[PDB]
Design a protein around this motif. Structure first.
Motif, PDB file in Angstrom:
ATOM      1  N   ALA A   3       4.207   0.848  -9.819  1.00 17.43           N
ATOM      2  CA  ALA A   3       3.581   2.005  -9.223  1.00 17.43           C
ATOM      3  C   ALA A   3       3.665   3.197 -10.128  1.00 17.43           C
ATOM      4  CB  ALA A   3       4.271   2.305  -7.892  1.00 17.43           C
ATOM      5  N   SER A   4       2.648   4.039 -10.050  1.00 21.10           N
ATOM      6  CA  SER A   4       2.670   5.327 -10.714  1.00 21.10           C
ATOM      7  C   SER A   4       3.441   6.301  -9.812  1.00 21.10           C
ATOM      8  CB  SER A   4       1.248   5.840 -10.943  1.00 21.10           C
ATOM      9  OG  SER A   4       1.278   7.020 -11.715  1.00 21.10           O
ATOM     10  N   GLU A  39      -3.781   6.695  -2.492  1.00 22.98           N
ATOM     11  CA  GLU A  39      -3.321   5.336  -2.345  1.00 22.98           C
ATOM     12  C   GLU A  39      -3.107   4.652  -3.692  1.00 22.98           C
ATOM     13  OE1 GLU A  39      -6.162   6.552  -0.882  1.00 22.98           O
ATOM     14  OE2 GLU A  39      -5.912   6.204   1.281  1.00 22.98           O
ATOM     15  N   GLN A  40      -2.137   3.752  -3.704  1.00 25.84           N
ATOM     16  CA  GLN A  40      -2.055   2.701  -4.721  1.00 25.84           C
ATOM     17  C   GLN A  40      -1.908   1.383  -3.973  1.00 25.84           C
ATOM     18  OE1 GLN A  40       0.667   3.610  -8.028  1.00 25.84           O
ATOM     19  NE2 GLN A  40       0.714   5.688  -7.209  1.00 25.84           N
ATOM     20  N   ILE A  66      -1.159  -2.515  -4.525  1.00 27.52           N
ATOM     21  CA  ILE A  66      -0.613  -3.420  -5.544  1.00 27.52           C
ATOM     22  C   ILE A  66      -0.141  -4.706  -4.863  1.00 27.52           C
ATOM     23  CG2 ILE A  66       1.127  -3.698  -7.348  1.00 27.52           C
ATOM     24  CD1 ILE A  66       1.311  -0.602  -7.454  1.00 27.52           C
ATOM     25  N   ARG A 108       0.846  -1.185   0.000  1.00 27.71           N
ATOM     26  CA  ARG A 108       0.000   0.000   0.000  1.00 27.71           C
ATOM     27  C   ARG A 108       0.884   1.237   0.000  1.00 27.71           C
ATOM     28  NH1 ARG A 108      -5.735  -1.107   2.980  1.00 27.71           N
ATOM     29  NH2 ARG A 108      -6.203  -2.851   1.501  1.00 27.71           N
TER      30      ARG A 108
END
Ligand SMILES: [Ca+2]
Length: 223
Positions: free
Chosen positions: A94-95, A62-63, A65, A49
Motif C-alpha cells: 500500500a501507498s 481508495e486502494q 489490492i 480495500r
C-alpha cells in the motif's frame, strides 16, 4: 456498529474492508504489506480495500489490492473462537499518506477502563438489519475480566476481552468482524463475537491482540 457515530471520511486510516465481491469483514493495516483480521473472516479470494469511507462509491482515496496469502492462527478454534486472529498479505505494498496508514501493535496489554475506538461497516441495528455505507465509530471502554466472564460463563479465554456497555445499546455487530479496537494509538483488539448486538449484559468480545505480537512479528519476518 450499533449506537455509534459517523467517523468521517478517512479519519480511521488503518481501517480496511475485506471484499469478496462485497464487503464481508473489517481488518487493520499494520504495515504496507499486511493486514490483521479475525480468523473467522477467513476465505479465499480476498481483495483488501484501503482508504474507504463509502464502500459503495469510489470517492478518490481508495486502494484495492488483492491478497497473496492468508495465515489463520495455528491454534484457532472455530467452535470456541479462541485465537480468533488471521494475517493477510497484500500482493503489492500500500501507498502510505495520512488517509491510508498503519496502526501500531501494542507493546503492553491494555487495562480495564481504558477507552478505545471500535469501527466498521457492520449492522447498525440491535433488532433487525441496516448496513451503512460509510464507516461508523464507537468509543467504548475495556471491561474487567470478572465482568466479562460473568457475562459469558465458560466462554472467555485468556485470549479474549470484553469492551462496551453492560446497559446495552452500543456495540459492534455483524459485518464489523475482524475490525479494529484501538486504544491510545495501539491495536489492542479485533472484533470477534458476542450474543446478538448491543444487548443488555452481553458486551462485545474481542481478540486480545497483545498476546499475539510475537506471532505477528515472526510471521511477517518469514512470509
Ligand atoms: Ca469508496
Amino acid at each position: 456498529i450499533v449506537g455509534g457515530y459517523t467517523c468521517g471520511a478517512n479519519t480511521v486510516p488503518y481501517q480496511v474492508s475485506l471484499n469478496s465481491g462485497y464487503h464481508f469483514c473489517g481488518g487493520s493495516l499494520i504495515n504496507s504489506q499486511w493486514v490483521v483480521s479475525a480468523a473467522h473472516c477467513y476465505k479465499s479470494g480476498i481483495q483488501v480495500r484501503l482508504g474507504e469511507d463509502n464502500i459503495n462509491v469510489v470517492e478518490g482515496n481508495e486502494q484495492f489490492i488483492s491478497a497473496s496469502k492468508s495465515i489463520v492462527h495455528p491454534s484457532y478454534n472455530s467452535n470456541t473462537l479462541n485465537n480468533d486472529i488471521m494475517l493477510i498479505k497484500l500482493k503489492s505494498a500500500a501507498s502510505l499518506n495520512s488517509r491510508v496508514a498503519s496502526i501500531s501493535l501494542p507493546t503492553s496489554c491494555a487495562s480495564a477502563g481504558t477507552q478505545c475506538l471500535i469501527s466498521g461497516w457492520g449492522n447498525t441495528k440491535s433488532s433487525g438489519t441496516s448496513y451503512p455505507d460509510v464507516l461508523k465509530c464507537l468509543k467504548a471502554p475495556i471491561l474487567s475480566d470478572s465482568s466479562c466472564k460473568s457475562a459469558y460463563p465458560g466462554q472467555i479465554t485468556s485470549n479474549m476481552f470484553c469492551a462496551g456497555y453492560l446497559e446495552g445499546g452500543k456495540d459492534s455487530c455483524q459485518g464489523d468482524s475482524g475490525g479494529p479496537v484501538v486504544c491510545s494509538g495501539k491495536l489492542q483488539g479485533i472484533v470477534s463475537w458476542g450474543s446478538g448486538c448491543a444487548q443488555k449484559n452481553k458486551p462485545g468480545v474481542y481478540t486480545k491482540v497483545c498476546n499475539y505480537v510475537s506471532w505477528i512479528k515472526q510471521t511477517i519476518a518469514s512470509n
